[PDB]
Amino acid sequence: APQEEWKKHFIHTGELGSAEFASVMSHTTSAMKSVFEQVNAPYSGMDPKALEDAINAVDLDNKNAPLKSVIDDVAELVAKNAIFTQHPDCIAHLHTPPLMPAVAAEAMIAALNQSMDSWDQASSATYVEQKVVNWLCDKYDLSEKADGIFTSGGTQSNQMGLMLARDWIADKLSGHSIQKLGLPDYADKLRIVCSKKSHFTVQKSASWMGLGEKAVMTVDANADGTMDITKLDEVIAQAKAEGLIPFAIVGTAGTTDHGAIDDLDFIADMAVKHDMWMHVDGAYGGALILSSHKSRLKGVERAHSISVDFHKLFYQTISCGALLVNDKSNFKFLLKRFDALKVFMTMQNVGPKALGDMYDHLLAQTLEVADMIRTNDQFELLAEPSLSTVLFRATHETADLDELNKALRLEALTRGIAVLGETIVDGKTALKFTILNPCLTTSDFESLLSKINMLAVEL
Amino acid sequence: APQEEWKKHFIHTGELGSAEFASVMSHTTSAMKSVFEQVNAPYSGMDPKALEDAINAVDLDNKNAPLKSVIDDVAELVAKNAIFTQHPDCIAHLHTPPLMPAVAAEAMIAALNQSMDSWDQASSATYVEQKVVNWLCDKYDLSEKADGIFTSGGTQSNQMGLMLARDWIADKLSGHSIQKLGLPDYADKLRIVCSKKSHFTVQKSASWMGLGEKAVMTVDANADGTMDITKLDEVIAQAKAEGLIPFAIVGTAGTTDHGAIDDLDFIADMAVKHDMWMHVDGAYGGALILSSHKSRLKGVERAHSISVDFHKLFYQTISCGALLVNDKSNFKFLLHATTKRFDALKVFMTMQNVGPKALGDMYDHLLAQTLEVADMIRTNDQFELLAEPSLSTVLFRATHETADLDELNKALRLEALTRGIAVLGETIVDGKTALKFTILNPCLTTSDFESLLSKINMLAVEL
User: Which residues carry this modification: N6-(pyridoxal phosphate)lysine (chain B) (predicted)?
Assistant: First the structure.
């Protein structure tokens, strides 16, 4: 009935159909510009309980306010108190400050609202995604039978590559269709091999697909975080001696805490020797394929599958991930948002070389930051960097450092002074920088170390 | 290292830090306005081979062009040749024209780039998501113990609801942790009961979680698309009598073709009698909770789990879905996506702006209009109505005294698409090719439908 009133809530084609659209989006842009301009820390420091109370009090039933005012309210309450990856002291996790071409692509994705499940919901988008996927297969130097699909991120990609592996091995061993029949009777013997430092989405993937955490067999890691190749075949051979069936092996290209890259070529050799599927978790370090350091990923091009997550080191907005396969017939076992537009635009604008130069810069800078910590007597460096993470702690001659560094991390977060990672290294609490922003200077790091020390002094 | 030239590629905080950002976004908003203004059909009608060739020819290596020109190029090649859900003649699928508040929300989501997996990556966002979840649990009248989480949409929500059911039943029967141990030895007996018209993500869900398509036990559907509850008790009793373990049942609130709503209350009573998990797939008709037709979902409040797709009839941009559970203790099975986006902002903004009553009013409208369109087809000798509508879909076909109708209706559907005249659904109804309207846009008029049927007839006359 009052359809004329409803027209303002929607975009329409033809003359004047998008005037309100342009007005509203111009308004949202200015609102966000004002937020960014007034940000002076990674977090506002607002009491999380007070923030929670104010959000909980918001009226979602009888407010019915003009959209521009709802945008102002969200700017003020939501945006102002968010975590600003764009601030130099937000430096904890694989949580990327977004690239401009991805933020622009999102504006077009939203307005078009294409659905990737069929051509007639995603005409030009279907071809864009395939073009990006084709280009990706070329960058990782995959075979002529290679293909890929965009997913929600590294988690869904890991789960998909491993679920492909699950169906692949059952078909191999006994021509058994898991898709039609469920898991085969020997499923309880199947085992996925991975490092102690691989992402927990390996165990989670195994649970989801019905094998359970018990299906995951770990191999000891080295001290730099890499899988220990001198133990690998032994773990596989002992399993087989016990009647177990190692069917998949996960090589990690960029561990979450160390940024370690497994020996992919040796892992690929093991996959050949023992007839396993190699899945490469390239969520973090897969971006190095564009850099001067591509050689560290040698063996990746031999993978059965590879998870690539663009919303980490490619700086794309969440979600943006792909799963690649060396042989697209493996997609037979399996027989949605336009996130590929982000990568399509990025590569035309910033381009792959620039991205690689950024990563070269990040690796060098991370070495420099380790050196800064090493020579600073209020800190202790806890590992030598492998990629763009730094592992370190505040130090004191009498204080209980586990206690100090846990308190430190949470205080810095709560006050909005810095957003720092926290892990265990060698049995000790470590703080973590995950350096992603390629525009930080040594003075940023110097100021960051000083903020952290000033907090340590008070605890 | 050219850190000063890289600066242009990123937003920064403080004075002048977001100047380029504003300029680029304003450019992009302008480019989309131009696109929308020049759009005059659901699809441009460009030869798909030509469009694919042009897209494949794009340089992703050595172009390295200024961002505004790349934006111009994508507007020209990608946007201009997209499927426009905003055009009245785009009317095939559960593919929604986006609500303005969802589009504005995406701008803020993209700029903040919060990651929902932890508070220190999503500080205000975590509470926004929980607020919206709590609100949803109210709207569906769930228990004091209810909770939910946002997902990528109906597929992920279906898979998660049924995976929870899978772990729930192993825990109940033998205290067996599927999380820790994998499927129990009796897994081969487990069965999920659904109708012949349920979404195929039930079978796909079963395949993903290790049970296989053979785990799905289908029950006959009535002609109107609803589950036939006539033999449902006996089908379950017989399965159990054979040593099978029916552990979950899917009630569909809005089937894909008919828009039929299963008798969710009786399914819930089956689940009490037979000790099963009832999962409600409300990806389509879950939205009716806000309308005058809420009564049709009676029984939804008793579900063990409910999937809700906001990017369908709630008009949110893809992705925007959630899975609700009546007892949050059931989430314990999940506890050992990661990186997930702040989609809940869309609903949070939409309910402040449009609000639930206005959406309810839109749905009342859509149900009435669908009946009106069915009537219009009924009294038009050029078409044959193939089902009485149940929600916002209409099933019909072009008719002719001698022509092969299966052939005619197939050809006109594909031709309407490739010429960009209309985006129409196609299905099978009583073994006959049917065309389909999925009416979603609440702003369409009688004259839109008259002209749409006229456009279709003219295609038919030529075929």
Answer: 312
